Symmetry: C5
Subunit: 311 residues, 5 copies
Amino acid sequence: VSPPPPIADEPLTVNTGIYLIESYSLDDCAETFKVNAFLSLSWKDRRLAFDPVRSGVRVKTYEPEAIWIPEIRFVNVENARDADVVDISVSPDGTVQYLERFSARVLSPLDFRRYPFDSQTLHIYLIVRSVDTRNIVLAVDLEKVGKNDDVFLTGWDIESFTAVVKPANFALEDRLESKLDYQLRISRQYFSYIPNIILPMLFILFISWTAFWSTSYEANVTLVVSTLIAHIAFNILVETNCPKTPYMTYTGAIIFMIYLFYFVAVIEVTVQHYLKVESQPARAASITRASRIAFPVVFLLANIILAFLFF
Amino acid sequence: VSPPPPIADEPLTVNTGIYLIESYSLDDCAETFKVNAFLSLSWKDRRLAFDPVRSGVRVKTYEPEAIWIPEIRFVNVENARDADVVDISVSPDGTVQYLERFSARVLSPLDFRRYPFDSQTLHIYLIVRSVDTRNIVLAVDLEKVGKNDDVFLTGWDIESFTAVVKPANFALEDRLESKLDYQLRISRQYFSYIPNIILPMLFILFISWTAFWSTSYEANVTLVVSTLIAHIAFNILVETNCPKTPYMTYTGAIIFMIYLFYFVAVIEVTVQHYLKVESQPARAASITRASRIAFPVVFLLANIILAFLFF
Amino acid sequence: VSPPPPIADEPLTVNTGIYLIESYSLDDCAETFKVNAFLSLSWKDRRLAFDPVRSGVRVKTYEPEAIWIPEIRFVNVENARDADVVDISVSPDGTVQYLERFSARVLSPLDFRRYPFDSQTLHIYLIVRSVDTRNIVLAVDLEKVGKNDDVFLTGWDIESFTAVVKPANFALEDRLESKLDYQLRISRQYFSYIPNIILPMLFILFISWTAFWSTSYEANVTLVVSTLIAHIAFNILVETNCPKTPYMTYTGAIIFMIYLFYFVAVIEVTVQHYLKVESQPARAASITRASRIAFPVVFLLANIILAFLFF
Amino acid sequence: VSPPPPIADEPLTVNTGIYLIESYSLDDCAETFKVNAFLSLSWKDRRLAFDPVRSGVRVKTYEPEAIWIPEIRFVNVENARDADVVDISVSPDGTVQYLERFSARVLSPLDFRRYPFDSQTLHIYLIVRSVDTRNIVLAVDLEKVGKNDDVFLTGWDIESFTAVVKPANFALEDRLESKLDYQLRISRQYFSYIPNIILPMLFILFISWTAFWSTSYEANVTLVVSTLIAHIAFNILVETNCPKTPYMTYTGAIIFMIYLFYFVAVIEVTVQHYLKVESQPARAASITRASRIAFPVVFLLANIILAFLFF
Amino acid sequence: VSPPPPIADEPLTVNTGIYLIESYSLDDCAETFKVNAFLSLSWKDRRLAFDPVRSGVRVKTYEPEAIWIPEIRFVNVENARDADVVDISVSPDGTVQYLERFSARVLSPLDFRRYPFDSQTLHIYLIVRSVDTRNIVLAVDLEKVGKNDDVFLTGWDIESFTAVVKPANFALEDRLESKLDYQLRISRQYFSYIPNIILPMLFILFISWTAFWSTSYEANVTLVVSTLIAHIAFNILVETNCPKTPYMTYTGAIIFMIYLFYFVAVIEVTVQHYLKVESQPARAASITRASRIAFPVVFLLANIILAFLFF
Ligand SMILES: CCC[C@@H](C)C1(CC)C(=O)NC(=S)NC1=O
Ligand SMILES: CCCCCCCCCCCC
Ligand SMILES: [Cl-]
Ligand SMILES: [Cl-]
Ligand SMILES: [Cl-]
Ligand SMILES: [Cl-]
Ligand SMILES: [Cl-]
């Protein structure tokens, strides 16, 4: 139980691969996702080499304790992987074929700027710290990287499970460290978003705009203010349950603009009344009449500006 | 501790059986359910065979470490099953009778399209990866598949516990994998749904429709808008608190239609007043009178269309 | 480590016992209660017999690994018991005296039909699967059953901790299984219930009835509708946090009836106004005057009907 | 190994103590608190006694496996303590000095009757079950009982960590049990309660009382009812998140009283209008004028009665 | 497995270092943060020293069980560290180079007085208890104290990861303790705070101030009270979810002042009406006109006072 010696002065290349079995619990708030997968490792340890003629066997099976296995760890895991060795197979030349089944809650940041049209790239970082005896470098076996066809994330389109084939080798505390990036690309499945979140919220803003075809200040205060309460209550109903993102989101910008529209509508309603009370019903009625077109138009344009601005 | 050798080139047939002891924690949000059950495994290892005359014993009991046991794993489990071996029995011919008790949170998707009248089929996938020495294939022992009569899920009718007898054998990473599906069929209990969710939500809506027997715009704005707030508060009140399904549900469609009805009712109330203010009380009163029948009728039909459309 | 042999063809009687140390985490939603307790087990393994003269000890203490212990398991536990062996003592005859401190989240259904006046019987099921060598049957040593006086459940009166002395012996997967029932009887502590839940909700409904001493439709719409919003907001404030029980509860029936009363009150208010607007202030005022008595009376009787109906 | 033998017929006295290192996660709802602390155990085992002259060492260090250690357990812990042995030191006379570092979630009831001015006594119960060979009794070593100066609980003043020096020795299942009570006294930091909870809630109440300087029934219904909604919404905003305490709290009594005041205020507003409509504006105006003083006075007195009643 | 002996009467110096790999789950409510990092320990054990000539090896690798490793523990961790030894290397002189990978939820208080402009210093306390044989003192190896560049906390600026080089040596339960302070500095990066929390909350407040350009008491009651409900509902929407901080926060002071402004605005509205009803429309209109400037000015100044007062 010591690393295999180098033929020359070459480092030990370990052939990695992750095959996704199950993907679940994608926590948008915590920026985590639980994955249940296979981990395939391969390296050549000539100390384990055998003659298939003399041995009379094609490949020999070993116990993890019996042979030297590289210390492969994950970088962005919450709690260390629940490892279960499935099989260890040494071919006659000494090439070890290691396979384990694991499950891990992965920490991977998410960008909600383009939400709910957002797409995400989920990372799984593999790492190996080079020993005293020799240096270890990770490699990707593209045949052993993939995902089950049943692999799902509710509300997401699982685009691809790939791996940046070139490791990021670097020095950490006077030792070499070889890091591999495994990427899971997903795009949001948002059709229910329009009837469930946008349209209802829109009718609410629209009900406020009916105050442009009314002269009763009592009815108009009730119109714009009550729809504001209705809007806040509606947003309480839908609400994401995630702490505010430090950055400004697309949906967040629209919501901000909606609060601004309720404020401006109150200004109009207030002005309309003050002009009417200050015996200027020419200006009072003209503003109201303008707003009837101004509010829907400006809203429509301001959303076009934002949509363009974010996408 | 190596697989039993084949008589000829035949694969190892492992006879399974899952007997449900307890079923609990069905998370509609997470699409999981925890299950407490028995796992019965059986295979013939002639290396372990004996003469009952010479041995003087009926059946010999072994420790898991002592004999070769196939690596049976579950496909759709969150964290690897809490396994406890109950008994291992080897009959004189070498037939191993393995039984373990386990508990695992099983990831199984749910279809809420027909909610709350929905029925679900819960999957438990058994799998075995074929070794170098020989190929392993799973089989179902229908005598050892069942469930306790005490097995319950609050709010569900546990219909059946059945098993797809024919395994799905396939190749994965150059090795054969035999997969079995165990189905748990459940149907929802929607007794309380009508008085707890549907009826109060309908009363709130009907309160809005009373604005068709009134000419006071102040009282009418108050009627349709306040019921809208009441409706949103009532929906906050029900609190399913499951993130919106990406897809459109039956209940979700009705709710959408309800938001639309509140909007249209505001249009009517607004129009009624504008016609009355624009000295056309013939059209004003006629629309209000029409709506008195139009709103209940269109609602009734639109729900019939949906009910039919979803069921 | 094999069962003790029978003198004649008698089964092994494992005398049991459960002594509650702590009881906590009663989750009404999950139908679970966490219990921290002692487990007392006794059987005769004559293979362990000794002469105290030759031994020099009147009783010998053993490690769990050293001797044969029955495989006792709990039926309705979420995750396998957190077992800690306190003591194993053998008397000269070979009578084993086992004691273990365990803690487990027990799954036991709850009947909320009579809530908040409901009483519950929480179950803890002990089981043992009979082996090939000999059959095992469980018994209750009534002296080693009981509960600490400090044992509490906030908001419940812990009535008793008793055992169904006669085990339920049955056949499961061709083997005998002996099951014991441990019952924990509890009754709820309502009383905060009247000032915290009923009266404030009851006041809100009476505030709606003040619309029977008013003729202003604007003030009456505001009265009955605003109290409806107040009622929903109040129920959001109290709310149980449990998903709807599939069955109709007593409290749930009252709440349903309250929603119905808000609807009927809106009908009255609407009718009163329509009669007054259709120049029939004789009928308008008579209905309002009737309601003044009708609403409180019908409510009082309808609650009496329900109280009687549920209890 | 086996307990030390008694010199005469005396029981083994175990001197126990621990200094709180960290205290965190005080869950008011669950009546639990996580504590991270030291556990110091001491007893004399003359079998381990040595001559410091012959040995040439002052104190010998042992491994837990090597010597006999008493089975000390905690009575009120959720899941069994996370024990880590720091040091075992045996003095020449045979006095063992055991010290472990542990962390455990402790179940200890809380009395919210005087909330938010409440003070609490948190219990940690130590226990030891006496063996067959000899009886074990617990003692407190006051030098080894303490709490870190850094030990904090957010929103609590950590007063004293003391221990009831005299154990509660009792018989349980025919064996002696010695129990020590360690108490953690804390007082609540209620400063932010006045500006955050009591004053905004009261401003809301007073806004309702402005209806005593108004004659408009429409404006008065709006005043008292809308402030009621505002009050419920405000209470939803502040809300503790803890299930209802079965008993009546001080804050709970005030809140009850507030709901009663909103009801009575609606009675006044209703009466005032009915008298005014019944052409009796002498009585109408007199009641309103009375209330202007009656409501603030009765409130002030009723709170004095309660404050006195609870404290 | 006993501490190395001192050359003279010197204590054993253990050179420490913590390298942050991942930082996640910063719970503002619980005052915790999970950290995934490296722990580098170094000391000289001359009992392990060797001749590189005779041995033919530069550095020898040992198993944790084989050699003596100091009992290093963390002070402020929730649950015992998830330790995994990466490498143990002994140089010819006997200098041990220990490296492990750990993950732990660290309890570290937070000061929200200056929230959301607040900055925090996160502590990680290393400790070692001095043994009987010799005294142990901790040291910082500044070369082995860093953080990964990828290390992130969403909504925070990870400024630095430093260590107080001089340990805090003290006596605890008659033994010497050496404690090291590793402090992580983070400044809250909450850009989105103004458009997401402040701006909408202010629009809501200003809507109330429009009641200064109106004489309709019905419309004015509706203005100030409804905006107050809107404000509470808005605050329910943006709710932090953390229990009230015992102390007064900056944001909390502003919110308090906002509740006070809604109260004063109701006083004005009430007074304005009473003066108008008591035939004094000179004073009524003058106060309303004053308020138009008084309310915005006093608000602006009062916020300047607070901003200055807190920062
Ligand atoms: C004319 C008073 C209407 C009133 C009940 C009003 C709207 C101003 C409403 O409709 N809803 C709510 S939640 N608050 C209010 O004050
Ligand atoms: C008219 C004001 C409506 C108030 C709605 C409040 C909803 C709060 C829900 C909070 C759930 C925890
Ligand atoms: Cl890991
Ligand atoms: Cl599994
Ligand atoms: Cl169990
Ligand atoms: Cl314990
Ligand atoms: Cl630690």
